[PDB]
From a paper:
Trp309 has been shown to be motile in the comparison of the ligand-free AtzC structure and the inhibitor-bound structure, suggesting that this amino acid moves upon substrate binding.
Author numbering:
A (entry chain A): 3 to 403
B (entry chain B): 4 to 403
Write the structure that this text describes.
């Protein structure tokens, strides 16, 4: 048969028209208004949007769903602070077993693929209590999940390199076990040492030739200062394009001139950013960042744990959440958010060359029940079909892999 | 014996699981186990059963006018009140009775699918819509009465002192049977705060109806406008009969302005509605509720030239509010749940017949989640909706 799979009547946003999509193995082979030829399996999109797989650029699969199990969410009789949530992890990771972490990771993944997410980058706690236990469970589950979702794994020193002094050796080990990236947390208010926390991160990154994804959630000028130091060291170390800053809440409350002055530094350093829809500050200058050409992806962050009680692993729900946080309504703006959950996330992850609905690219696709990006955000219809490596893995809200 | 029993229903106010027995349109028995079987039963399977959600502010008449193309119509340009007013005037020129009616019913069906059984809609009354939109809404309201209770506000969307035909058209609308009267922005729309408000109260007293005013003006001008409204509420003997919609101004006005006004609002019995399509992120929602202010919640417009969004789903709206307002604790999520239920009931005036208690209306929603908190978080679809003791929704289908 000429194609292994054809998608019929697929509206493609980037072309603003309806096409048949022909697939062989794990690749898109043909995109034509009508495809002639024999074919093994077919899906009719019926004039609706077909999209590349959504990118969830920042998750914590390892400690997800730990809030579940009772009538009320566990942990949430008290308000969120970073330091208190760090203490809850340490206590949780004391008795947590390999298999239950694994189970949580797989559950998290299944929930994501059900919503059309086919690429994620997760961080995993590495500290003196979790040790490499959580890393091992994640890497193992990642192996089992490879026909459903691509996972990048950040060795994440959640307690601080200069607070928990066992962090440096545990991370080295985690990187040797095969984690893809390295990152720490809040150089200023967590580490109390900006130059040293950052220099150490770059040293470890260069030793194992891995990219970097840093949690910088500190607000105000202290946050912008921290990100500036990071971007400057990015250049000094020859790591242009290899560094991501997660959160960057500080862009919301720091004076706007601080960001205006830093933008050229961010472009020069190839600095990439991820805003999580469970925390994007309402005054975050998201539109402004994108119009200035900054690479800004989007993400669930934590899901149903002791940091964040929320989460459905659904980036289309997350897109709606961002329109509301940021008070957007125009079709153009809703389109920029759609880019955030797709092609911007691809760039953050480094996979842009194989990403998109174009001849030659990976047959990783989502058939939606809505007419357009805008309409999908608005109506929140469930996914009709999910396709990974040219194979149907989701149909009718069931994982059929 | 019972016309209907709901089995294994978790009830939040009691924090326990119960069977619920219903006869006609009333709840008759709430017991841990109800002895005997009946023809019509629903098993909630340990999940939350809730009173019907209240969507305290909608515009059913002009809903879904954005639909019909690949991209939402109207939204190639940004929102301003005045521009959206002009779009309505143009839309209402050629709009027919039946098309408005169709939109109203569609809106209602969408709402009941999500467990909303009570709504208050505003309907445009001005020199182009005239009473055409009122007539279509009232008619559809009559057809929908087995699905959802509707209150209808005669709403002078263009301004009493801007469109001078408004006063007579509203009087007519009220005589046709609209339940409430309201205007818009006494300051930046009417350019006359004392007169726009005094006229609204005159019309209200002529027809003995309650009031629901759109005050979206920001800052001190908004708070000042609401203060004048609350003060006239007292002067006119209308304590408890006045609702202020939006009140965005509580978000940006200095906090001391609100602190000083709160006793006035309590004295006047002022009621408020925040719409989840616009609640400002710094709106002091929690603070209002802890001070004992009655604050309901609402979709506002749905897929029109004011708001492109909307699914008429208050549980989705509750999630939206947690994100706008940055709430996470179980207590705070519980206050939002109150906003979409019992607070809305109070705004609408129906609290005596509202709740899952013996004696109250058998208007209920069987959810697929364990608790208010878990429902907000997981957004599971509704299992069953019951209105006047009859099943009207099952497995996402309207079965009435
Ligand atoms: Cl330093
Ligand atoms: Cl005045
Ligand atoms: Zn994180
Ligand atoms: Zn309104």
């Amino acid at each position: 048969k000429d194609f292994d799979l054809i998608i019929r009547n697929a509206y493609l946003s980037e072309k603003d028209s309806v096409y048949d999509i022909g697939i062989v193995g794990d690749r898109i082979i043909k995109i034509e208004a009508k495809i002639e030829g024999t074919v093994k399996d077919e899906i009719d999109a019926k004039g609706n949007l077909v999209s590349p797989g959504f990118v969830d650029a920042h998750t914590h699969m390892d400690k997800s769903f730990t809030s579940t199990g009772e009538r009320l969410p566990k942990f949430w009789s008290r308000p969120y602070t970073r330091d208190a949530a760090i203490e809850d992890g340490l206590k949780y990771y004391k008795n947590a077993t390999h298999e239950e972490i694994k189970r949580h990771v797989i559950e998290h993944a299944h929930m994501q693929v059900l919503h059309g997410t086919l690429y994620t980058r997760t961080h995993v706690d590495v500290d003196s209590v979790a040790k490499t236990k959580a890393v091992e469970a994640v890497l193992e589950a990642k192996e089992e999940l490879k026909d459903l979702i691509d996972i990048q794994v950040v060795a994440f020193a959640q307690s601080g390199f200069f607070v928990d002094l066992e962090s440096e050796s545990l991370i080295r080990k985690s990187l040797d076990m095969g984690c893809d990236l390295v990152g720490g947390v809040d150089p200023a208010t967590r580490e109390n040492n900006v130059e040293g926390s950052l220099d150490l991160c770059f040293k470890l990154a260069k030793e194992y030739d891995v990219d970097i994804d840093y949690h910088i959630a500190d607000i105000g000028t202290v946050g912008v200062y921290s990100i500036n130091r990071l971007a400057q060291k990015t250049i000094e170390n020859g790591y242009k394009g290899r560094v991501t800053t997660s959160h960057a809440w500080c862009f919301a409350d720091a004076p706007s001139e601080w960001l205006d002055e830093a933008i050229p530094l961010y472009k020069d350093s190839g600095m990439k950013f991820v805003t999580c829809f469970s925390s994007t500050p309402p005054t975050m200058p998201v539109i402004k960042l994108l119009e200035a050409g900054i690479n800004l992806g989007c993400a669930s962050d934590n899901i149903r744990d002791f940091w964040v009680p929320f989460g459905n692993g659904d980036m289309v729900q997350g897109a709606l959440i961002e329109t509301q946080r940021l008070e957007l309504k125009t079709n153009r703006d809703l389109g920029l958010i759609w880019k955030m959950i797709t092609s911007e996330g691809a760039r953050v992850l480094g996979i842009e060359k194989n990403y998109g609905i174009e001849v030659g690219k990976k047959a990783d696709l989502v058939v939606l029940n809505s007419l357009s990006p805008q309409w999908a955000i608005i109506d929140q219809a469930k996914r009709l079909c999910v396709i990974k490596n040219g194979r149907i893995i989701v149909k009718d809200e069931v994982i059929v892999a």
